[PDB]
RNA sequence: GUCCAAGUCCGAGAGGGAAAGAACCCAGACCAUCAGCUAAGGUCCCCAAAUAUAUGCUAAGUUGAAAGAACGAGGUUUGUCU
RNA sequence: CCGACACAGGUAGUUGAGGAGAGAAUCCUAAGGUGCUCGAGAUAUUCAUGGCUAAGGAAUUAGGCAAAAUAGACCUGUAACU
RNA sequence: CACGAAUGGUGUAACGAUCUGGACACUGUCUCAGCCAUGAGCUCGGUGAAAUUGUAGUAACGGUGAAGAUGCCGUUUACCCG
RNA sequence: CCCAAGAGUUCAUAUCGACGGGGGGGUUUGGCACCUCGAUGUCGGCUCGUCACAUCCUGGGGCUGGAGAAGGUCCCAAGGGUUGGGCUGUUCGCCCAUUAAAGUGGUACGCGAGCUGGGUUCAGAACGUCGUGAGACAGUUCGGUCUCUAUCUACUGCGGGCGUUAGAAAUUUGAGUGGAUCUGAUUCUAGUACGAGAGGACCGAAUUGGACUAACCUCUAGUGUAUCUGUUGUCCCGCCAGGGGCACCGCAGAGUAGCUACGUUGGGAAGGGAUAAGCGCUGAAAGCAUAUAAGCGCGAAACCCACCACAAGAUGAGAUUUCUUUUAAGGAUCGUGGAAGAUGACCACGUUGAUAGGCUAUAGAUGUAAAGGCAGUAAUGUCAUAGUCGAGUAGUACUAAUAAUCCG
């Protein structure tokens, strides 16, 4: 029984769960656009919502927050620099996730992570 | 909740200090009993002087209890000792004295001999 | 446990009937006239159209 | 509506602001064979739990060398002018060391 | 006699001479008769009453028809009465009004589903044994379920492990509290089954 | 107080004689038992 | 159950009957036939043939398969004496 | 290398660092070497290895089996018996 | 019934992964089980065995029977496949 | 069960009953050796139950050497219940404390492809006794491997196909099946009836518990590897400050949602029919008598209803309202999620959308963040009820739910 349990334990501990959301967090700050499964980026786009969140506002406690979560002095000054001032305004949804079928070792079904104020040639409707 | 092999605390001037519970009266496969409630004992200390003797076996009722028992408003009571009082042959209390307080429960089961000589209630 | 009886071709047939395979939900997109997958991304021509429109211009 | 219940079904009390650390005295109206009188239980707050209109907290004393514990719901038709000495100045939320531990020493800090 | 009502939530209230009471919240809406059953078509007297309204959208034509032989359109729960107190007739409508302040009631509701649940939860089952004293993977088996040779088969009915899941459940005369009516309260006293927003049907 | 047990007969329909029915009411109401 | 004696059967034996039974009752199978007569046992239906005839008993569903006691009783039919 | 295997086994000797430490114990790291040749979802029953449990504290069981409890340095003190 | 003095008799400080009885502390051993994490298990993609096997479209009851019936007799029950 | 010498103050049958006799059952010890030695695993205990009544309690009566209360005996009755420990491997048995009671038995002395191996029949060693000896004991003591991935049937759950005579969306009747049937204490009746006193009721009416069971998380309590805080060792972010990794979640203090009990609520209530033992009306056979032969009135936790759940594959496949009458009604694939769930299935939503997430607020958890100023020599305290989280709630399309298809 799970009747309320909102978090994916993706099969692994509880420190090389945060440890890989951690690791994607700033590869897909760094490069806009990453290739993972479908469970994984669902996970992924929690745990970056509110990151991106707080980068709104550049203040010395928000840049420890969120150092704290990404790890990586590098993926910090990439989310401050330039995302931020790209996103802008937006109330909310600062990603979007799209299936491009399946892999071929063990056939896991696959996601396009993106961030949505970085690709210019797609609008959804 | 005391129950069978549970080791209290005698709390009166009947010459007992740690007595062990044998059985919870007032049923088949009665499990638990709460303040207000009679078991049988039997007397493992008996205080040099006293007026009991080790190994008798006795009844006595619960009075204080470590678990937090609730009353009908709402309200819960809880103490800090499994303590106990020894009773005679009949419904009646042996001694003349209660250390520490009591439960306010000891009173809707007419136990006004225990209830009117405690410090506390 | 060991089995007692080999089992027959008749009884190991019927119990091959929910053993089928299942055909994918395949789409047409009315762009590109290109098959994919139902609510999946395809890639035509170094790029990636998704409703109409191109997500990814690898050109 | 569960909150236009609670606010309405619920008479809401006038008790001044406490909570963990604070001493108080809390003046009960105890019921006997036909007839009320009010009684007075002195101790330090140990917690308060709840949300509201089903919030307790608890408060503990040392009767002689016993100590007692009680449980009140704030909103009881019972309780009447709860009464504030000391005041506060812990470290917790829920200070339940206090329970298993006595003497001279661990009585209480004072607020400054 | 019968209602259709939503659970909302448990709280606790406290009675006019002392004691405190747990109570339970079932926003009782406004149920619309929707067809009496009479007992010359049919076969018997009773009649069904809707609860909540739906739109345009999911609704079926079969309900829309349905539902225009009478008052408010297709509804969410759909349930039928019988043995009620007042003769009505199509259209009509039923707040909360029936119940009064101290009656008993006896809602029936739908509990939670715990999925497949082995022996020890469903039925009670206690382990095979101790823990340590040689217990080798039985702490929490069924142990045997039958006899030798005689009769060489299970019995029909043996306890074993399923979906225990959420079946309907009534709870035999609770007390009803608040009857406020400007807001369907329906306050009664003690538990339901099911969990928050869920339909309950409140007969009396 | 004290309850009243009102013992009336009635012609029952199954068979044609006179069977009989008692129950325990209050004192002041087998007034109206024994009218029905 | 076991050990002898006088027979029969199974053993080494098909077929019919008792609902199904190696021995109980009838009866000793060279084949083929969409022929007839009978044995044991049966003729309301399952299931071939009598809801056949004449006389009396049973009220217990006794009984319609086999198999029961010491001891009770104002159940009933019938013969003699009295 | 020896074990049928690209096998959780066995295989003499030399060098074998830092912080805290008596220590080659123990925890984290140096240089160096690896992620152990099937993965992804989901988070039933159940098993294996683990964590925490209100009140009681051996009432369990053939049996305190298994767990828990004491555990370091420096001082005070330490019985019958021999 | 049926110990007995170098196939040694009687005691004995220290010792024993020895056997037996009792006490304190401690605890899920138990009253009485409850919650959580990973591996296995469950679903999907790849590779892919073995023990076992007269043929099988493989029910229950009462009974019979080489004396304890899925396969025989009578009755009852049961849509086909996982 | 039959006869009844007696015993019972006298009186065989209130109660017991010798000397004798007639049967039922197959739970003990036996008799036989009929299936199994190309294996039917044996005692005790645990879990799980199920059946008979030859009934321990509760239920209804007859007699009494039954004044009342407590008794004795017999009859009807199987719905539910029928405790925990000390000793012993024990079955059994004795004892301790309760209870309304602590039933007798069967199912391979139920159940080892369900568990343990404490006892017994494996190999080691020792004692008593027998034998010259190797060795043995219905003599005792210490130790000593319990194998197997479920094919068929039997059960507990969940699905797909087809049929119900054109097809769908809903609501239901009920041929039936399953579940629960426990009971104590106190008060009034009433210290009344009865009894010389002591003692002490029938019937009826209320209050409150024990065990069992179902639901739920408002309260209490547990967990809560979401979350918050304190702290130890070492490494890392170039250094200080501040953080992160590992050390059982490093340890320690709390903890929302969820799941649970140790918690809360409810239930076994009431009312019918035919009855068993048994109690009566009228009345003959048999001018009397007789509860029976005709006909009637009562009579139990047993049976059929009744309470709850399921139920038209009930092939005997039911009924009603509405819609469409063949690519129509409608269903499905796929996607967003769940209070649903192993997988199927179920439920809400799919742009004329609030289904999930984000965002804005908040119930709430933790406990006063970072940077800076002030006080001291410093550790530290204060400005500073703030920071972080928010598994819940409400509002907003910012992100994802297509512009396909299939069956009909």
């Keep these: 029984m799970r009747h309320g349990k909102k978090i994916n334990h993706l099969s692994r501990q509880t420190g090389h769960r945060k440890a890989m959301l951690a690791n994607m967090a700033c590869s897909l700050i760094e490069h806009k656009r990453i290739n993972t499964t479908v469970a994984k ?3 992924l ?28 002095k590098y993926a910090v000054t990439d989310l401050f620099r330039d995302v931020a001032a790209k996103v802008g305004d937006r109330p909310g949804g600062y990603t979007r996730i799209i299936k491009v079928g399946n892999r071929l070792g063990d056939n896991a079904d696959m996601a396009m992570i993106e961030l949505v104020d970085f690709n210019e040639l797609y609008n959804g409707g | 909740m005391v129950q069978q092999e549970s080791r ?17 009266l007032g049923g088949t496969k009665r499990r638990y009993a709460s303040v207000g409630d009679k078991i049988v004992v039997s007397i493992k200390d008996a205080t040099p002087n006293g007026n009991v003797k080790k190994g008798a076996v006795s009844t006595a009722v619960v009075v204080r209890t470590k678990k937090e028992v609730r009353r009908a408003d709402g309200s819960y009571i809880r103490f800090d000792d499994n303590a106990c009082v020894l009773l005679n042959a009949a419904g009646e209390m042996r001694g003349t004295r209660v250390f520490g307080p009591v439960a306010r429960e000891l009173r809707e089961k007419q136990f006004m001999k225990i209830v009117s000589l405690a410090p506390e209630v | 446990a060991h089995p007692k009886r080999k089992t027959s071709k008749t009884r190991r047939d019927k119990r091959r009937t929910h053993y089928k395979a299942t055909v994918a939900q395949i789409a047409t997109c009315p762009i590109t006239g290109e098959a994919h997958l139902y609510h999946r991304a395809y890639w035509h021509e170094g790029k990636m159209y998704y409703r109409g429109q191109v997500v990814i211009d690898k050109s | 509506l569960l909150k236009f219940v609670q606010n309405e079904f619920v008479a809401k009390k006038d008790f001044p602001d406490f909570g963990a650390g604070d001493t108080i005295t809390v003046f009960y109206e105890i019921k006997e064979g036909e007839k009320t009188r009010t009684q007075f239980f002195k101790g330090v707050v140990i917690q308060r739990r709840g949300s509201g209109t089903t919030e307790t907290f608890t408060i503990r004393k040392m009767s002689g060398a016993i100590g007692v514990e009680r449980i009140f719901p704030v909103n009881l038709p019972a309780l009447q002018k709860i ?27 004072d607020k400054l | ?30 149920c619309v008769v929707t067809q009496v059953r009479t007992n010359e078509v049919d076969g018997y007297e009773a009649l069904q009453l809707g609860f909540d309204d739906k739109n345009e959208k999911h609704s079926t034509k079969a309900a829309l028809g349905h539902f225009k032989k009478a008052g408010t359109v297709a509804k969410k729960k759909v349930v039928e009465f019988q043995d009620f107190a007042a003769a009505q007739a199509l259209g009509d409508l039923i707040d909360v009004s029936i119940f ?59 306890r074993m492990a399923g979906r225990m899941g959420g079946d309907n459940v009534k709870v035999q005369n609770l007390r009803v509290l608040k009857v406020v009516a400007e807001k369907n309260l329906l306050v009664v006293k003690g538990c339901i089954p099911g969990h928050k927003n869920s339909y309950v049907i409140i007969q009396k | 107080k004290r309850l ?15 069977i009989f029915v008692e129950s325990i009411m209050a004192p002041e109401l087998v007034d109206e038992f024994l009218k029905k």
Excluded: W
């Design chain 5, 1 to 30: 006699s019968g209602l259709i009502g939503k659970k909302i939530g448990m709280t606790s209230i406290f009675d006019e001479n002392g004691k405190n009471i747990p109570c339970t919240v079932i926003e009782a809406g406004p």
């Design chain 6, 4 to 18: 009243s047990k009102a013992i009336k007969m009635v012609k029952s329909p199954k068979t044609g004689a006179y």
């Design chain 1, 41 to 43: 980026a669902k996970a």
């Design chain 4, 83 to 109: 009464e504030i000495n000391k005041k506060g100045a812990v470290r917790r939320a829920r200070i339940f060391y206090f329970r298993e531990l006595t003497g001279k020493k661990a009585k209480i800090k």
């Design chain 5, 100 to 158: 009064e302040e101290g009656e008993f009631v006896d809602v029936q509701g739908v509990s939670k589903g715990k999925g497949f649940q082995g022996v020890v939860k469903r039925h009670g089952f206690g382990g095979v044994g101790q823990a340590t004293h040689g217990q080798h993977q039985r702490l929490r088996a069924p142990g045997s379920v039958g006899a030798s040779s005689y009769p060489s088969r299970v019995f029909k009915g043996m």
């Design chain 2, 8 to 24: 209290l605390k005698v709390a009166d001037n009947t010459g007992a200090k740690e007595v062990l519970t044998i059985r919870v």
């Design chain 1, 45 to 72: 786009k929690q745990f970056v919502e509110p990151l991106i969140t707080k980068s709104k506002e550049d203040t010395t406690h928000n840049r420890r927050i969120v150092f704290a979560y990404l790890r990586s």
